[PDB]
Amino acid sequence: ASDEPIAVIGLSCRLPKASGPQELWQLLDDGASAVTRVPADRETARWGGFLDRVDTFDAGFFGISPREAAAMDPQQRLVLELSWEALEGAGLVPATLRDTGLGVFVGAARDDYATLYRRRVDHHAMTGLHRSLIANRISYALGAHGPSMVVDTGQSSSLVAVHLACESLRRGESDIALAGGVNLNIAAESARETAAFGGLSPDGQCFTFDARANGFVRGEGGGLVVLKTLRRALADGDLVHGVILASAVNNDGPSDTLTTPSRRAQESLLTRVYRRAGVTPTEVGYVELHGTGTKVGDPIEAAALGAVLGTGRDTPLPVGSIKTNIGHLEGAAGIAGLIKALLQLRRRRLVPSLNFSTPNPDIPLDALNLRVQQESAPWATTLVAGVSSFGMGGTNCHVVVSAAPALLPWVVSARSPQALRDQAGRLAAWADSPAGREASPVDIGWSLATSRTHFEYRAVVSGSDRDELVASLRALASGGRLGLVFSGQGSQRAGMGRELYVAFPVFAEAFDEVCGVLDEVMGALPPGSLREVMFEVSSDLLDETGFTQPALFAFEVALYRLLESWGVAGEVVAGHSVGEIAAVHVAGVLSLADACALVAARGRLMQGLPSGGAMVAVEASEEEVTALLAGREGEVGIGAVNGPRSVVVSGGVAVVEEVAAHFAGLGRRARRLKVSHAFHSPLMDPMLEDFGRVVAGLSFAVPELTVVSGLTGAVVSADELCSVGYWVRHAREAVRFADAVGAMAGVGVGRFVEVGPGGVLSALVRECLSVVAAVRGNRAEPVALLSAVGELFADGYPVDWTAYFAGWPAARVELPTYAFQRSRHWLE
């Protein structure tokens, strides 16, 4: 190939009875005609290919007032919609193209709306009726800096637009390009001008190469193609719908009449563009004709293909013309013909050219070695197609296109609750649709995660198969700094992490590393596999603190590593009791070794204390509980200040029963806690000095995150945090959690996540004040976690869904485009 071959990496279209590429394929393949009588709500030649309507547009989506929309050429409105759908089809998040060198090249040859406006003024009319802004408005909305132009070569406009885009890319003038065109038939005045010229079929059909050939039927619509160099496309890993090998445009020069096509100039166009691509008559599998069904122009076009691609070829060359389905879109005829060729190439199947029974007797199909495609066959030999588009004033263009070289979240977003619903519904319908079933739920989720703008109204549906996800969608259609609070003793439960281990590799890997180290530590000095204890439902070994502490630590670090791989990075950490060890380790204060030595030792040295220890949860202020226990310091103290009217009293089972009795006796909530010992009381004084010696043998570094102390109730700095005195005091004195929450809020935490099992700490954070428990109870752990990271994402946290799918080998696949909230905008 002479010059950089160019990649079609996406496309959009509104055409008669074909609102998008999928519908277009349906129509062509079914051999269906979208030509109808003029709809009654249009004005009046009594036949045409019309859009279901041209009056509706989501002005708000594109930051346009209802008055500006009303003054705006529906062509300008449609090409905005097509621009957005072209980029989404290609998988490019349009915000990533802001301030880049994206080119916009549009064929537009008709200003009907300007005709209506002027046959009957505010500041809006200038921009709304000026043709230049069919391209310029796309460029302004995407903030693109590439060249932005409208080209008028009559009925060849939209393919010349593609050419200028290919050349722009080849020269490095633009790095990506939107190219195509638009033609909306909305004024009678333009219908009468083409009628009086004599060119319209009285039957309202393009009898392309058929002998009934007597003129064209009008059509309306628009198309765009997303263009990158083939090089840049492959490199960036883009879906390649086909590749433009060569484009050319010439003019008839000295035609018989100004408006007669010249066989000579067509041959010259064809000889050049194919030679430039290096494609012999035999390598071309199909040609998408101009084929308007005119008496003069059909034979001349047949002739020209017969001279250049007829001679030098065994089999006849299949030809056809989308004008037989949707009519002559004029300015946007060429991009119509190209988008068909592209669908044929991706599907690897041909489709009928309608209105063909008896060949034109001025077109020897046998001699010229052309047969008209009349059947929806498959396409034999890669595959290569030519597209022709000719303007009445002589300027001809041809393009040569080749074929290309456990629990899942689906994320959906929109600019509006009503859009989010419509968005959710459109994905559900498509997921169940055949075309949606040629894509895996894995590929779909990854594509939703990486290839779609995250608009300000967002939902995550979860599910294990297509049916569960679709059902979740149908149901849907009906910040600050991120703070982590690490769960302590009480938050533990039999099974802890089994469901997460089977589900997420990243949890499993880290849970192995943490258990491997702990099995060695506890194997040496036991209170030998921590994993078996944790994952077994038939075991109460966890309620014993020499297992409880290491278990909470193992679950919490594995969980934190899973959250971290999802881009849920804590900026501030705190922990209730043993919670603090996980918090401190993931803040990088202790190596895994030292962390495991520390938590195991703590667990064991406390385990080997006698019974006679108890704790009770009490609905009472710190001030009340100080008054009640003052003088009993040696037997009992405050174990935790968890809320402003929530403290845990800890010590002698005797004196703890008494305190439970008192507060119950005052008609207050008093819940006896299931613990082996009186944690954070004088009963811990025996193991302290032994604990001090273990922490003395550990290396404490400065943390990578802000740590808030459960001892201090405040941001704790490294000099204090990296001392032996701190950790012994931590083991002994009251967990000032409620104060820790205030200190976190004080420092700018706006979102709180409980890292650990259940929601004990999440409740206490609610009491003190966006709070989410990473793994709430009475549901599968994967469910309750995805649910939790789902709220974070909806609340506005930038969860990295891309990195949820590094596990699977997920591939980008095409999706439904944005569900525009269209409303009527028009003159009066």
Added chain:
Amino acid sequence: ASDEPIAVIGLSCRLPKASGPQELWQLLDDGASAVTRVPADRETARWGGFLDRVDTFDAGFFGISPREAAAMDPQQRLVLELSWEALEGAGLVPATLRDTGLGVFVGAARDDYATLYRRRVDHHAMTGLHRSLIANRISYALGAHGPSMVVDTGQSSSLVAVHLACESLRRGESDIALAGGVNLNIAAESARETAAFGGLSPDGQCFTFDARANGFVRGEGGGLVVLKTLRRALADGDLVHGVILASAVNNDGPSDTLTTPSRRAQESLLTRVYRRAGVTPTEVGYVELHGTGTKVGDPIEAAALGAVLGTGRDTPLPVGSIKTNIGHLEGAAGIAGLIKALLQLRRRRLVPSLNFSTPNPDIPLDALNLRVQQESAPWATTLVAGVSSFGMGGTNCHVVVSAAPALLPWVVSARSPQALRDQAGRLAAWADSPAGREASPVDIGWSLATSRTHFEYRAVVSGSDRDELVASLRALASGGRLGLVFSGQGSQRAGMGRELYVAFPVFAEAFDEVCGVLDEVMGALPPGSLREVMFEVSSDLLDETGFTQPALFAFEVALYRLLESWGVAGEVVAGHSVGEIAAVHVAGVLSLADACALVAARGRLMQGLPSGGAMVAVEASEEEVTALLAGREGEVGIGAVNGPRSVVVSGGVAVVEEVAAHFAGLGRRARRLKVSHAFHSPLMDPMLEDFGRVVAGLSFAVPELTVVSGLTGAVVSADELCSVGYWVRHAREAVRFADAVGAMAGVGVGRFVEVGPGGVLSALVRECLSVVAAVRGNRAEPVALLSAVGELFADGYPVDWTAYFAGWPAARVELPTYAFQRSRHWLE
């Protein structure tokens, strides 16, 4: 320079009070404003730059009916006129561009005429009101095959058109390009649309960079530039008006408003285009601004030039804006700005930007290092200029242009007598105009000869200086096969060829070669310099036949060589008597040597016969003169049958006097001839056998032309012509000239030229039947010859005027363009 630098090899423009490049220079240099109130014959913002009119066009010139012209956008009409004037300005004969790859690229952003037509239908409206044909109609009229497109980028359209043309040329897509644009303000409806947007100055002036800046005043017009690669231009030897080093177009991307310009995107456009050209802030001598005189847009444009070309520069950068003279041409603003820059570059002088007194207080001219040109200075240091053009919808374009690296005939032609007059007058006025006086009469003639279509109504004016030629013009404003007949004895006159020898080198050179050989031949066997005898007025030596024959031969061959160098190539030749020797020699039958031996011998061998010989011209039929002389064969015969009632009787002076007496006695014309002897009579029998021996020693080849015999009266073939018998018989028997003329006509001669002095033979050709005597009498030989080759050219002979000027070192120079016969064409 990065890519092929591009040569501006010509240009045209209609602008307010500037009907062409010369008038435009007048206006800018005089610091004059063409802004006026809306002319009364237009409709209604009450201010603008308007053309004297938009309603007049030479439809016939371009093969368009008055009804098609009436349906045609004046924009389509004006760009046709500009296309033709652009090519003529460049010196290209438009017929030479037929079937070539000439590109047409036009900025057009307004369809006013389509607005008028539709606010009030035949087949003509479609093509007449469709914008595409602003370009396509140029392509159809010139029969060009290059890409042909209209581009709409709003107020940057016409400069983007230039860009796309430069890129087209660089890629080899086109080999020459017409680029520019057009904007005609003819509907009130478009005036109201821009008015309501708020952008128009209430004073009707662009106060460009001045503090009165309050909006733009509208303008109308069009411009084109002729573009070749610099390589191809120099090679083909084309007038180079300037060279585009680099062009660029980008878009604002995310501007404040859709219609706010971005300083950023302007800087990026400027940094790129100059870097691509390699031109530092200091090498740019002048910048032609967009400079619309808007409050928002002036500072932003100033700013952008100050960042890229301000910093890195000693002297302030001169800026200006043609919008201060003619208003904002919008679509055609850019080609207006470029054509100014080009004139500044060729003239090597700057011109004022009008409407500047007090700098805008948002434009620090000192800081940005920009001064506004307010004076018509000269341009110091080659010279390099930038042009900016910005569209309201963001698409900006900039172009970097550098300065370039005795008797005469003036030929004039037109499609009409009335055009030929108008054409002749326009060249006269221009010849006397200062601009015409910077070109020599030599350069002018050569340019008229080589750089202008030869239309079907043609005149040649002759003269020795500018005054004589201009006078000839003012006076003007108030075929078949070509046959040559070579003069014989009688046609000779004292001075023969002196006037032609001094005038035309090609005559002189050949007359030397022929005289050199003859001086040797006659020097040996004299009857010694033939030139002295011929050129002397005080000599009757020529009336003696040993000089008469060689003299006629010398003059005739020199003359034939002069005619031949002018592309006046005989296809058929005949000669009266000695005439035949010249005819036969130039037909290549005899070498110069053998021809000179033959004619000298003939002259001498006849000279040495006695007196007693006479000839008389007689008004009588051959039949009458046969009856009168029958029986007197030995004393007298017919010397010539010259017409049907014109014979020459030859023999004894006695019997010749008798015959003169008889016919005079019958009241008939009888003119006694001045000859030494009775040529073509029995008195020649003595020298015959001696003549036969001379011709026997000569080499006769087959002729390169058809020869018709004065002996035979018929086409003579080589076997007869290349025999000794023929030439002796030729010396003896009657010159059957009248029959020779019939045989020439019979074989398809439609134009007859007497090669020799006077018009004796031309009269006899008139008698027998387009007849012209190459050198008629009683006038300077150069005059009577140029006069003669003038008629041939006017009658339709393809005289090679180019080859009249090989003598001088003539250079192509710019000329007035075609004097269009404009008439009113409009709707009702």
